[PDB]
Amino acid sequence: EEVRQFRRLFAQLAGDDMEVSATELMNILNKVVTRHPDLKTDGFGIDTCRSMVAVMDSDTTGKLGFEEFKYLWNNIKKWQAIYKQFDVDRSGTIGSSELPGAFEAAGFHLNEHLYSMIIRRYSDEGGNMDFDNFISCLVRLDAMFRAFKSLDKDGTGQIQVNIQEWLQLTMYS
């Protein structure tokens, strides 16, 4: 099946240890994005990649096993299509006014206050977000939503966490 193929492909990306490290992820992502110059990016930095890996590293192995990578890549795949969808002026970046729509298109519904901070943390002087920031932001936003939901259950919508867990969730991200 299509999956068995990705499994086969993951094996080429994983290398001997069968997991994708932050370094491998960086080179892989940069080898892919360079082949799509229409995606404006300064490239995925090693720092951003350690953060993406850590946030996806549910089983804390320091690298990404098959399932994590697949989840990550499926997300990038989908978000990459949305990125193109919302780069309406074909500038290679997601303008600030197009951003809420793109996030919504990714299934994210925030508010003026979140978007403002998102922009602040992920956009350039002009309110524009390039490809690596867009992807890294969503990987993080998705991971943080799942973290909350998982820590919740089926209602409340207001989790409690001690210092051990707080540092876990924040330092390893």
Binding site: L9, V32, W73, K77, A81
Partner: peptide, 12 residues
Amino acid sequence: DAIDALSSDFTS
């Protein structure tokens, strides 16, 4: 090859 596969997953 591995990269070719991934790249083709990108739209456009």
